[PDB]
Write a protein that binds this DNA or RNA. Structure first.
Ligand SMILES: [Zn+2]
Lengths: 114, 91, 69, 239, 52
RNA sequence: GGUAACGCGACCGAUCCCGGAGAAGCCGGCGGGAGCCCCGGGGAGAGUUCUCUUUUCUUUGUGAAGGGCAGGGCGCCCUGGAAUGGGUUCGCCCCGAGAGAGGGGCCCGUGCCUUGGAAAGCGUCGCGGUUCCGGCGGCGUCCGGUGAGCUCUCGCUGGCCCUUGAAAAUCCGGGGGAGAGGGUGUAAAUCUCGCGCCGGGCCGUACCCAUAUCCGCAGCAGGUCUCCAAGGUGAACAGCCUCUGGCAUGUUGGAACAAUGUAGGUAAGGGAAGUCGGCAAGCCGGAUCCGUAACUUCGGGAUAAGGAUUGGCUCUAAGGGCUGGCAGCCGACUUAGAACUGGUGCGGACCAGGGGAAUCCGACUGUUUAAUUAAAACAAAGCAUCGCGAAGGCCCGCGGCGGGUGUU
RNA sequence: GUGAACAGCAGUUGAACAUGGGUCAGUCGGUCCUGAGAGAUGGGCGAGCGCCGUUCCGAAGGGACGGGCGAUGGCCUCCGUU
């Protein structure tokens, strides 16, 4: 039975203290520090709770060390908004633009009559 | 099989806090535990988040409704009064 | 540490300027060449003894060669 | 008590819901904003909602906090101004609306950005208008009719969260957490059980009052405890 | 400072310093640990100054 | 490059604007992966060996850093359109706003081995230096499937709130095109890809963490903030016996065994008849099976009140995965039944309910006079009214459009 | 090393006495920031040491992308330049 002791001065059950168990080459068991892992970045839409894939869910201080394609994906609005909401905004853009064209035609007809 | 005779969701409380008080509270408790049908989709997905707010599972659209119930009779009369004032303004 | 797969990359690594010291680990059925660069310790595992004996002569003379026991 | 103990504890409740700043766009125009999301704010019983506007001169994404009305949804265009149409969730001046309109978040004076009648399930009712010199009689939920100078603006509809005090309190375990969230004055102690050296109604061996509970309005501090200038008492007969 | 010990040794004795590790005694004195390069031996530089 | 999730190696770009991590409550259930345990065979050390014993115990691998393969989650995009209603959980939910059938694809991979890495370390046997020596030589550093066993981590899902569960520094992500670069090559600018070179100031690092190092006038039975936690018995982090570790009885030793003290038990027969006072003390005790009244806010009563059983040895029956209606191979625990038999013996030591009927008060959980009263005291679920529309209700103040209520 | 006093007798021993050693960091925590809260200061009050307040009646950005003009270090070429 590995009756372990402390190594640092922090004695209490602190939530910052996150360790894991691993076997040493010297055939004894001691803790190793787990790196702090964050969540995946959520899209800027808000209506879709599905987080984006292809991005390492990690502490965002690693993003200064990561490369450019590792940070953002090669897609329009990369790593900011999902392509479903992008094409929904494009459909809304085209439909409201054609509606404004119809309103312009009706305004031209209103100026033609009165 | 038959669980209880006449008591319902207040039956987990038991002998405490009287009979008529629990009988009065039961009508509000069943009305808040029974989910309502949405207007956009129509599916019974309106989950009670907190007071004056309702969350939908299918549409994912927050609807600010009543405290305990979804639509009150007072809100129906307010909507009818707004309809009447709109028709009176339109003439 | 990293592993060099081909003989040509190992020769281009051994002919560098910052090559400190190579060592030879002679275990059974394998000859491990370990070259000490600045960042990694680059290793070459050769299972053929005749190819390893040819490569040991193919080492350049301007390098600290040591056979580890 | 004077302070630092009986005060309401406000830590997670951030900010307050204020009415939009007046300008020419609220004087003789209108403008459209969107509803972002509604959320139950801590402390206040009624939930709040984010209403996003834009500045006509600048280019920052503005936001405004309003009281959430009953029967409203997120992702909706809200117009606001004098020339706006009549619908649910629309702030507009009182001189444009007709009489008999259920409004809330009303101003007692033009400029204070909304004070009267904006709690959980409350609305003030406009009785009648006056075209000359801009006067308006508005009945408050107490019953009194106040005269308002008709320069203010108010939204349309009742406040969401109506009928919260109809059900009695279930248990003291819920009551302890509720009053711990609200304000630390819940263990209400009887003044007879209190000591006579601090509370005036204390003292004596038996549990008796022995003095009239009615008190004059002209009274200093320490004595002024009880029914303050009670005209009548007991069961309310009729109105 | 740890660099000031290195400059003070390099100006006087003219010898290179690898690293400097210092502590403070409970009696109230700083105790340094000057690592030397292997080209100049510590026993030899002690025999040069005279101490043993 | 691909219809696509996305990937490869660097693959521009200001002011300003937007979004994310930061940065979030509690509980119940399920699944996967590790660590510690369990077993068969094979190895190195010892004990038992009047008798048997293929017996008993110690032990048997790998870090950080890069990559691949398992294995999970998929609310990720296509071929196609489903009611005689389908896939599906321990539980459920979803579905012409797109189910089952099919192909790809990213996220985490701590499990596998490869570079690190056997060189080191652990033993056994021998060779020296009488010694100073990361000394010297041979061998091992294993072969496998499992388990509601205990612990840790991750994932899925639901419930609870009249309570909605924190702020600040920091970073990159996205539109955006005013500018910097040039005439056909050794082009210019641009480099978040692999590299190469130099440094990262100052403060503290010893010991205890408790019936001898903290506080209590002191080697003071008191108080005393946290981590790690073997085998059997057993539902149990309950109680008892053993493994590792620690210990030599806590301001003293020897001798006989008076009365009266302190802590325990045993006591023929009656069993609260003594005493304000079954006060103290004593009995019942667990599990299985049968079975249960008065009154009732129908929820409780209730374990109501009550009864039968409690060993050893040796059998029978019932419930599963893999491969090719069908046969073989691996199998982990529970339940039911029968005879023989032990001096009626069995929850053989530990754990271990007193009920039934009445009267008064208070519903009750809860706070409580540190140190004579824990209760019918208080908090209290419900009800009843008083004042007040910010030119004011209340409180504080010596003062300043004073502060609190009022973020109302 | 010692045997003046203590360890309720006892002691060669001990946290007893005297001489000496013993704590080494680019990678460990503080250092950076804010929370509850405190507080300088505009302003005002107060005979008075001083008091109210944290935006409250205020002449509140001492920072910076680019263009022009004189000048310097390296052939003022290009950058820290002014
Ligand atoms: Zn809907």
């Amino acid at each position: 039975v590995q009756r372990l002791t402390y190594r640092r001065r922090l004695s209490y059950n602190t939530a910052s203290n996150k360790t894991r168990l691993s076997r040493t080459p010297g055939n004894r068991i001691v803790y190793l520090y787990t790196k702090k892992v964050g969540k995946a970045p959520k899209s800027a839409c808000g209506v879709c709770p599905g987080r984006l894939r292809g991005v390492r869910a990690v502490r965002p201080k690693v993003l200064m060390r990561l490369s450019k394609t590792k940070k953002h994906v090669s897609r329009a609005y990369g790593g900011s908004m999902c392509a479903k909401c992008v094409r929904d905004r494009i459909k809304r853009a085209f439909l409201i633009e054609e509606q404004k064209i119809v309103v312009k035609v009706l305004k031209a007809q209103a100026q033609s009559q009165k | 099989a038959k669980r209880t005779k006449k008591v319902g969701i207040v039956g987990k409380y038991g002998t405490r806090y009287g009979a008529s008080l629990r009988k009065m509270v039961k009508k509000i408790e069943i009305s808040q535990h029974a989910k309502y049908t949405c207007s956009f989709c129509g599916k019974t997905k309106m989950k009670r988040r907190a007071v004056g707010i309702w969350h939908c599972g299918s549409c994912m659209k927050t609807v600010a409704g009543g405290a305990w119930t979804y639509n009150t009779t007072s809100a129906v009369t307010v909507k009818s009064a707004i309809r009447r004032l709109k028709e009176l303004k339109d003439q | 540490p990293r592993k060099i797969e081909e003989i040509k990359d190992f020769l281009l690594t051994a002919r560098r300027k910052d090559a400190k010291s190579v060592k030879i680990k002679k275990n059974k059925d394998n000859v491990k060449f370990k070259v000490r660069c600045s960042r990694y310790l680059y290793t070459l595992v050769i299972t053929d003894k005749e190819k390893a004996e040819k490569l040991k002569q193919s080492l350049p003379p301007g390098l600290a060669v040591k056979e580890l026991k | 008590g004077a302070g630092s103990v009986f005060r309401a504890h406000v830590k997670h409740r951030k900010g307050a819901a204020r009415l939009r700043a007046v300008d020419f766009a609220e004087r003789h125009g209108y403008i459209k904003g969107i509803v972002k999301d509604i959320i139950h704010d801590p402390g206040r019983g009624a939930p709040l909602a984010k209403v996003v506007f834009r500045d006509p001169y600048r280019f920052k994404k503005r936001t405004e906090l309003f009281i959430a009305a009953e029967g409203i949804h997120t992702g909706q265009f809200v117009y606001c101004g004098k020339k706006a149409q009549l619908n649910i969730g629309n702030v507009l001046p009182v001189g444009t609306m007709p009489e008999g309109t259920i409004v809330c978040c009303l101003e007692e004076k033009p400029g204070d950005r909304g004070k009267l009648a904006r709690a959980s399930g409350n609305y003030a009712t406009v009785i009648s208008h006056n075209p000359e010199t801009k006067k308006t009689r508005v009945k408050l939920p107490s019953g009194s009719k106040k005269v308002i100078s008709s320069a203010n603006r108010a939204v349309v509809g009742v406040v969401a969260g109506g009928g919260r005090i109809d059900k009695p309190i279930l248990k003291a375990g819920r009551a302890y957490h509720k009053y711990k969230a609200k304000r630390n004055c819940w263990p209400r102690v009887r003044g007879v059980a209190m000591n006579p050296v601090e509370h005036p109604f204390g003292g004596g061996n038996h549990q008796h009052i022995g003095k009239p509970s009615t008190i004059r309005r002209d009274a200093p501090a320490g004595r002024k405890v009880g029914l303050i200038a009670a005209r009548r008492t007991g069961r309310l007969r009729g109105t | 400072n740890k660099h000031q010990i290195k400059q003070a040794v390099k100006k006087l004795y003219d010898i290179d310093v690898a690293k400097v590790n210092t502590l403070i005694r409970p009696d109230g004195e700083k105790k340094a640990y000057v690592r030397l390069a292997p080209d100049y031996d510590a026993l030899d530089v002690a025999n040069k100054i005279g101490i043993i």
